[PDB]
Write a protein that binds this ligand. Structure first.
Ligand SMILES: Nc1nc2c(ncn2[C@@H]2O[C@H](COP(=O)(O)OP(=O)(O)OP(=O)(O)O)[C@@H](O)[C@H]2O)c(=O)[nH]1
Ligand SMILES: Nc1ncnc2c1ncn2[C@@H]1O[C@H](COP(=O)(O)OP(=O)(O)CP(=O)(O)O)[C@@H](O)[C@H]1O
Ligand SMILES: Nc1nc2c(ncn2[C@@H]2O[C@H](COP(=O)(O)OP(=O)(O)O)[C@@H](O)[C@H]2O)c(=O)[nH]1
Ligand SMILES: [Ca+2]
Ligand SMILES: [Ca+2]
Ligand SMILES: [Ca+2]
Ligand SMILES: [Mg+2]
Ligand SMILES: [Mg+2]
Ligand SMILES: [Mg+2]
Lengths: 438, 54, 342, 423
């Protein structure tokens, strides 16, 4: 057994983390007070669920998690929430005033004064680990804390934990729910600084989740609560292999080995099916073939893009529920004769498949209906570069006029960091095109 | 198709299906960057207070 | 009030479409870089498809299918026909072609060339590429063709027995305009054009062998003698087929043309369809056909950004607004729908 | 707890400031004695932004009242909510400022400014995490204009890392007290260009035209003008006073609204403006909110381009329909929004509507058309300054003509900077 530490940064990271740990407890049978009756080894153990939960002598199962935000109001919700008893105060770190949607304010000005406290609280969790394998970091691209403090934290983590893997769950900005005009700046600034420090990053575009909630859950105007419950389902299916018995993606290193052959190209596309409204009294349960075919529909992807006009480097299928390998292979054979699935020539055309018999857990009273089987596909396709092109274009429009740049320079950031970060993204877009286009 | 590396357990199973064969900055350096930005903030504030003194 | 942007000033077809949209009083033209548009008349090269369909509250439509270049390039069309099981190498309506780089089929072309010369049969081939604007060599010697390319090209069998119009004993080719809407309905414009050579066909000068409108207007002394602009329309051509060959344009030629158009576009439908996509596409195509002396139709070229005949600009462009634009953005048939199974 | 310290200076500043506190006390359920008597916890969730909590669960406005004569502040203390203010926060002299920016900034005001800063310091010292200041004042008089800008400069010196926000009433010959108002306004505008992060431009010309043309008031009074200002001030501060995601504090608002530091002068707008029981639909709220007749700066937005826009909807309504209408206005008139700032229009919705209305909308625009306001003041300035008319009132207080020439050039530079980004 090897422990994993989750770090939740800024409002988006904290609220998504709260939804994930709520779901983890429901999946593992952990009560809001931390008790877990199915766990017969009181006060210890090296089971698969112990990668995410430590144990006290009283039988409380405590998340291996740190929450960090430069404003106290969001984390105060965790302090007085349903699962408040899971966490002790040392895991919840709050500042007085936030980064005001300013990467430079979160990274330089406020980050310099709180980085040592955050690392000390992470060190306390690492000291409880007999074999820590690394970190999962949840944050937004657009916020000042999620962008600016995360990049500083990721730099320091590479220094203090040089051999440890680091995975990201990153929220890509969408104007339908965004709260700042400068979010394209913050997204590109934090991607540039974090790129060399992240081994594998799962980007989630709020635009895709918003439309999935509207179209498949019949929510007229989705809130963060609707979005985060769906995101936590995708995150759960991604991390389930670390928390349950199995042989695929059983450690953080295997995520890079299975999904990231080229280190800079470490942004796998996630596609999830089925998303079914709980308001429907009776819904026809989708087969293995139907949910697998849905993994190749852009309407089900965490980022809207067209994988037909790119190339695949790796593909993983993560099933939960009533699924047997025979039906998976039969579904894959039919799909290959209808879909445009092109792998790069230096990679084998294939799928790594993992099946967990336990069907997905839904939050009682939530928007998502219980289904007999579901699947999350993780594919490293060059088509996700469309998201970088959208972001870099908005950056270019504002930076050509130096709009809002004075806010960043006023925090001690040099203007050259803008163009340096943009040049890095230009090289990133060129890498994707060299890999996926003939 | 070819199915390889089939592993089975009580809670599920995993395998691989093949359709076709193929064809860091130091702690000191980070500290210098944070202090350099703080020094630029101090310089900008000193110039403002000088301007207000005039 | 719908909004649109214009990003290809050199397009004569969509300059008329844009003129028609403004004349409706219900469409407004924005700056070419304004992202809050309903319709994009995009550029030919590197159209930013990845930035479409990300504007909240705007149904967005573009006049090009991403990926349709596979059909509209010389080397890409040859590879698509040979490698697709729907079309296969046994495809009967496409001339025997090979992709030759200056993946490479040099030995395959020489194998069939040596097989023809040994068999005492017709062994004339034509070399061309997508870079040929007004770069084509017709020869019976394979050594002369391979040496010309080294100076990505394709070499296909030159149809040595074309259907020759009389009087004149002259060559021609048939252009068909095809519109594919956002639902992937295939509409064949009822009006085609025969771009005719004004010189007599000599099987022993590229002016009588190449039916391009620019070549006939720059090298043929008989330009405009038989028909205006070396363009014969379907009404006269159908009358000729009845008087000369006792048949109709529909029976002898158009059935094959509709079959070829349907086959090509259905083959690439899974790769380019925008059915469940966050933006929608339509596109106007220009299919070029050859007819041999036995009334067999051969596909030669698919143009992704075709122009139109001067007499047919008004009718066709209005038809574009009707079925491709107003079907998505309704305001306040000249096409033959080639039915198919999606 | 991100506290804001409020300051009101001069006759206009104290009269609109008192009405602002009357309006938002009613919205938060605070009675004239400081006791809460509301029925929604949303009234108290962000109450500490503007109110200190005293003994007996009393709520005291974090407000400081300044004037160089006691007249208007005596009327405030005798007003409806006069007893709600902290008595020690009344700081006043006796000489007055004679509608003279020099008296407010250099002579009379200099004698009183230290006592104001002592009160500001006491309020700031009790703040958990002070986010900044808001000042209400006019630019056409002497105390609000001259001493108000003096106060801003000294507050910036003592609190250089805090946001400075102002509600600045611009003079107009249509509603004028003295002929020297263009002098006082031009001198003050340069101060605001340097020392505020956000300034709401409230044009008395616009307020008069709205009362007369729209509200059908043939003889508008200052009280009628201040009713529009109160409603506007309540709307633009809604995002600071109630839970929300967008522009929840003064710094995030500035980061969203100010792409270039000097161009921080906003055109506010309000809807509905009814001369009264009829329900107003979301399309009507949105169209009226963007109409020039609902703007408070007397500038035509179609004569310029929007750099940034903040919109706040209040009341129980369909947020789906709000999003659709806000997208409609942008997609209908996309030429009036600069294309080099993508998605520059942000929308907030608060469930609690203002008093007497089921639904309302407030508009905050950073438009290049605001240069028409500064051009208007600059022309009136030059018409007098070219003949050095009325300058003796100012040179008698120690000012030199060169300071007027520099203020003139400074505002013409501001106009040219707006014209740069309009092209
Ligand atoms: N999916 C999702 N996105 C969120 C959530 N909260 C904020 N966001 C997105 O995150 C971006 C804003 O970043 P935040 O996380 O709110 O900001 P922050 O990290 O707290 O940083 P500062 O507030 O500037 O100090 C916007 O694009 C929001 O749409 C959330 O709970 N779920
Ligand atoms: N295999 C073949 N057999 C006989 N004639 C041929 C032929 N290929 C081409 N031709 C003749 O040569 C001409 C030029 O062929 P090509 O398809 O390259 O035109 P082009 O691409 O230069 C202009 P367009 O885009 O309108 O077709 C054709 O119009 C046709 O008359
Ligand atoms: N809207 C509004 N404007 C006012 C009010 N009182 C004065 N003004 C304007 O303010 C300017 C006069 O400044 P004033 O505040 O009276 O002088 P001060 O006491 O020295 O600051 C003129 O332009 C007046 O039109 C008021 O109650 N409401
Ligand atoms: Ca145990
Ligand atoms: Ca590392
Ligand atoms: Ca004195
Ligand atoms: Mg925050
Ligand atoms: Mg061509
Ligand atoms: Mg007065």
């Amino acid at each position: 057994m090897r422990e994993c530490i989750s770090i939740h940064v800024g409002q988006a990271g904290v609220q998504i983390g709260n939804a994930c740990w709520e779901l983890y407890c429901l999946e593992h049978g952990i009560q809001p007070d931390g008790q877990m009756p199915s766990d017969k080894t009181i006060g210890g153990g090296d089971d698969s669920f112990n990668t995410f939960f430590s144990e006290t002598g009283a039988g409380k199962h405590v998340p291996r998690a740190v929450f960090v935000d430069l404003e106290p109001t969001v984390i105060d919700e965790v302090r007085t929430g349903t699962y408040r008893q899971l966490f002790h105060p040392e895991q919840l770190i709050t500042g007085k005033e936030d980064a005001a949607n300013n990467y430079a304010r979160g990274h330089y000005t406020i980050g310099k004064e709180i980085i040592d406290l955050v690392l000390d609280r992470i060190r306390k969790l690492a000291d409880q680990c007999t074999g820590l394998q690394g970190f999962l970091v949840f944050h937004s691209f657009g916020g000042g804390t999620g962008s600016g403090f995360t990049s500083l934290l990721m730099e320091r983590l590479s220094v203090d934990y040089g051999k440890k893997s680091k995975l990201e769950f990153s929220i890509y900005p969408a104007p339908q729910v965004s709260t700042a005009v400068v979010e394209p700046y913050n997204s590109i600034l934090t991607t540039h600084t974090t790129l060399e420090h992240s081994d594998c990053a799962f980007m989630v575009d709020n635009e895709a989740i918003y439309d999935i909630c509207r179209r498949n859950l019949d929510i007229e105007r989705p809130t963060y609560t609707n979005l985060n419950r769906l995101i936590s389902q995708i995150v759960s299916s991604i991390t389930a292999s670390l928390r349950f018995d199995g042989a695929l993606n059983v450690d953080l290193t295997e995520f890079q080995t299975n999904l990231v052959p080229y280190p800079r190209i470490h942004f796998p596309l996630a596609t999830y099916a089925p998303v079914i409204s709980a308001e429907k009294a009776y819904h026809e349960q989708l087969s293995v073939a139907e949910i697998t075919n849905a993994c190749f529909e852009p309407a089900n992807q965490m980022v809207k893009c067209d994988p037909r006009h790119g190339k695949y480097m790796a593909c993983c299928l993560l099933y939960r529920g009533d699924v047997v390998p025979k039906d998976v292979n039969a579904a894959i054979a039919t799909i290959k004769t209808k879909r445009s699935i092109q792998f790069v020539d230096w990679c084998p055309t294939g799928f790594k498949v993992g099946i967990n018999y336990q069907p997905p857990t839904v939050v009682p009273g939530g928007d998502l209906a219980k289904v007999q089987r579901a699947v999350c596909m993780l594919s490293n396709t060059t088509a996700i570069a469309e998201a970088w092109a959208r972001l870099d274009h908005k950056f270019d429009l504002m930076y050509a006029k130096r709009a809002f740049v004075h806010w960043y320079v006023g925090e001690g950031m040099e203007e050259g960091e803008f163009s340096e970060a943009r040049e890095d993204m230009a090289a990133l877009e060129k890498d994707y095109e060299e890999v996926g286009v003939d | 198709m070819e199915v390889i590396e089939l592993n089975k357990c009580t809670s599920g199973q995993s395998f691989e299906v093949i359709l076709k064969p193929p064809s860091d900055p130091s702690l000191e350096e980070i500290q210098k960057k944070l202090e350099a930005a703080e020094e630029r903030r101090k310089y900008q504030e000193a110039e403002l207070l000088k301007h207000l003194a005039e | 009030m719908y909004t649109f942007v214009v990003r290809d000033e050199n397009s004569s077809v969509y300059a008329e479409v844009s003129r028609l949209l403004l004349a409706t009083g219900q469409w407004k033209r924005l700056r070419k870089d304004n992202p809050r548009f309903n319709l994009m008349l995009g550029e030919r090269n590197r159209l930013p498809f990845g930035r479409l369909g990300h504007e909240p509250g705007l149904v967005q439509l573009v006049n090009y299918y991403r990926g349709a270049d596979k059909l509209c390039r010389k080397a890409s069309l040859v590879k698509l026909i040979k490698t697709s099981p729907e079309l296969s190498e046994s495809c009967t309506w496409f001339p025997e072609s090979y992709v030759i780089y200056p993946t490479d089929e040099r030995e395959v072309f020489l194998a069939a060339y040596n097989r023809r010369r040994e068999g005492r049969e017709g062994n004339v081939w034509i070399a061309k590429s997508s870079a040929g604007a007004k770069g084509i060599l017709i020869s019976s010697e394979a050594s002369e063709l391979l040496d010309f390319i080294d100076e990505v090209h394709v070499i296909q069998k030159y149809l040595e027995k074309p259907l020759l119009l009389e009087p004149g004993h002259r060559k021609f080719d048939i252009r068909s305009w095809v519109l594919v809407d956002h639902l992937y309905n295939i509409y064949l414009y009822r009006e085609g054009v025969l771009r005719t050579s004004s010189e007599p066909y000599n099987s022993a000068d590229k002016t009588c062998h190449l039916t391009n409108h620019c070549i006939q207007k720059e090298y043929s002394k008989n330009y405009g003698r038989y028909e205006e602009g070396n363009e014969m329309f379907f009404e006269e051509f159908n009358q000729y087929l009845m008087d000369a060959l006792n048949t109709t344009l529909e029976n002898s030629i158009l059935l094959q043309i509709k079959h070829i158009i349907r086959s090509c576009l259905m083959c690439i439908e899974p790769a380019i369809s925008t059915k469940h996509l966050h933006y929608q596409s339509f596109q106007l195509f220009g299919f070029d056909f050859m007819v041999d002396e036995e009334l067999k139709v051969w596909l030669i070229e698919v143009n992704g950004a075709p122009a139109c005949a001067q007499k047919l600009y008004a009718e066709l462009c209005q038809g574009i607004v009707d079925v491709a634009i107003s079907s998505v953005f309704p305001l306040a048939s000249i096409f033959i729908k080639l039915h198919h199974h999606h | 707890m991100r506290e804001i310290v409020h300051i009101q200076a001069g006759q206009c500043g104290n009269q609109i400031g008192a009405k602002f506190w009357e309006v938002i006390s009613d919205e938060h359920g605070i009675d004239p004695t400081g006791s809460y008597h509301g029925d929604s916890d949303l009234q108290l969730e962000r109450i500490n932004v503007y109110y200190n909590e005293a003994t007996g669960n009393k709520y005291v406005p974090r407000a400081i009242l300044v004037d160089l004569e006691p007249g208007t502040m005596d009327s405030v203390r005798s007003g409806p909510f006069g007893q709600i203010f902290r008595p020690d926060n009344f700081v006043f002299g006796q000489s007055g400022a004679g509608n003279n920016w020099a008296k407010g900034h250099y002579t009379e005001g200099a004698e009183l400014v230290d006592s104001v800063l002592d009160v500001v310091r006491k309020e700031s010292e009790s703040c958990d995490c002070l986010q900044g200041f808001q000042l209400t004042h006019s630019l056409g008089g002497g105390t609000g204009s001259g001493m108000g800008t003096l106060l801003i400069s000294k507050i910036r010196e003592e609190y250089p890392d805090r946001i400075m926000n102002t509600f600045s009433v611009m003079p107009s010959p249509k509603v004028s007290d003295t002929v020297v108002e263009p002098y006082n306004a031009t001198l003050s505008v340069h101060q605001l260009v340097e020392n505020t992060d956000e300034t709401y431009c409230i044009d008395n010309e616009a307020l008069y035209d709205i009362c007369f043309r729209t509200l059908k008031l043939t003889t508008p009074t200052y009280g009628d003008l201040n009713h529009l200002v109160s409603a506007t001030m309540s709307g633009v501060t809604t995002c600071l006073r109630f839970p929300g995601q967008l522009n929840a504090d003064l710094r995030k608002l500035a980061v969203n609204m100010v792409p270039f530091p000097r161009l921080h002068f906003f055109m506010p707008g309000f809807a509905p403006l009814t001369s009264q029981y009829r329900a107003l639909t979301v399309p009507e709220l949105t169209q009226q909110m963007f109409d020039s007749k609902n703007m408070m700066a007397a500038c035509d937005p179609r004569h310029g381009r929007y750099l940034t826009v903040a919109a706040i909807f209040r009341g129980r309504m369909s947020m789906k329909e709000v999003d659709e209408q806000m997208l409609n206005v942008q997609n209908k008139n996309s030429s009036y929004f600069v294309e080099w700032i993508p998605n520059n229009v942000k929308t907030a919705v608060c469930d609690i509507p203002p008093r007497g209305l089921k639904m309302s909308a407030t508009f905050i625009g950073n438009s290049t058309a605001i240069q028409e306001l500064f051009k208007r003041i600059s022309e009136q300035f030059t018409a007098m300054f070219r003949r050095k008319a009325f300058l003796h009132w100012y040179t008698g207080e120690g000012m030199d003509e060169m300071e007027f020439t520099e203020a003139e050039s400074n505002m013409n530079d501001l106009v040219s900077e707006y014209q740069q980004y309009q092209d």
